[PDB]
Structure 1
């Protein structure tokens, strides 16, 4: 329950949070154990895990279709934005291990800051797939969303863009 979810938010889906292609980690059951409505809270929480499952499938294939040294650089980046979202799922369990009363809500509050970085970093990734921004025009689609305006997703996309600039400062240093 607090170890089934604190791993379901991570990549392993499990029996409660069944995975499907049309919709991801959508728990659909009437359970005596959870309160009738915790499923409504869980449904809101499930949105975060679905994108974390998907973001890793994409980093997996990279690092005919998309190919290049940039998709081997935007992808290393999607690992670093996701790093404070791995350490923040490890700590939830550590608090949960000793305190026997903390309930699902504590998960909601602790993981509410990841409902602004994750939804707006998912459109950059679908843009790079629906349109084959495979060549050096990948830097454009990071700096076009990097002006941004929602500040949490504005420095996140900054982390990804700078890495690209390090690959674009090594090809252009061998030339000049």
Structure 2
């Protein structure tokens, strides 16, 4: 249970958090020890998991229609923004092995900064797919949201952006 949640967070939810193709991780299972209102808490948490699940598919196809080398670079920075999302998941199970009294609230406050990171990066990911931004105009489409206004999305899209600039110094070295 302290790995089922910490895998439903990652990419494997089982039958408690049944995945739906539109948006998944649905719960209807009953327990006396999970509070009747705690289903709403878990529903608040599953928003975080769905975005990571979609991110993994998007990285799975890369690294015609939409293609290039930028989709093999922009996804690679999307790895680097997700790395403190993996490290802080390992740290959690390490803590839960020792102390059994920590509840759902610990993962909730501890990973509360990705409820600003995940939606505001997810909108950029959806925008680049629904629109046809797949040449060297990718740096602009991220360059408007990298300014941010919330600090997680202010720091993440920069880390992705630097590699896209790095592709722009290999075209402009062969040319120049």
TM band (smaller chain):
over 0.9
Tell me whether 84-93 or 57-66 shows the greater mean CA deviation.
57-66
TM-score (norm 1): 0.96
More divergent stretch after superposition (88-97 vs 147-156): 147-156
- Structure 1 outlier segments of 4+, above 3 Å: none
TM-score (norm: length of structure 2): 0.96
TM-superposed CA distance for 1:72, in Å, is 0.7
Q: Report what 1:78 is aligned to.
A: 78
After TM superposition, list the pairs within 5 Å mapping 1:1-176 onto structure 2.
Answer: 1-176=1-176
Aligned residues: 176
Greater CA deviation, 129-138 or 23-32? 23-32
Structure 2's unaligned 5+ residue stretches are none
Q: Deviations over 1:27-60 (max 9, x none)?
A: 2233334221211110000000100010010011
- Displacement of 1:25 after TM fit? 1.2
Counterpart CA distance in 2 for 1:65 and 1:31 is: 48
Shift of 1:96: 0.4
Query: Quick one: distance in 2 between partners of 1:64 and 1:169?
Result: 25
SS in 2 for 1:69: coil
Instruction: Quickly say closer, same or farther: Cα 1:137–1:112, change in 2 above 3 A.
Output: same
- 1:123 positional shift: 0.6
SS in 2 for 1:20: coil
Deviation at 1:151, TM superposition (A): 1.6
Q: Which has the higher helix share?
A: 2
Aligned alpha-carbon RMSD (Å)? 1.1
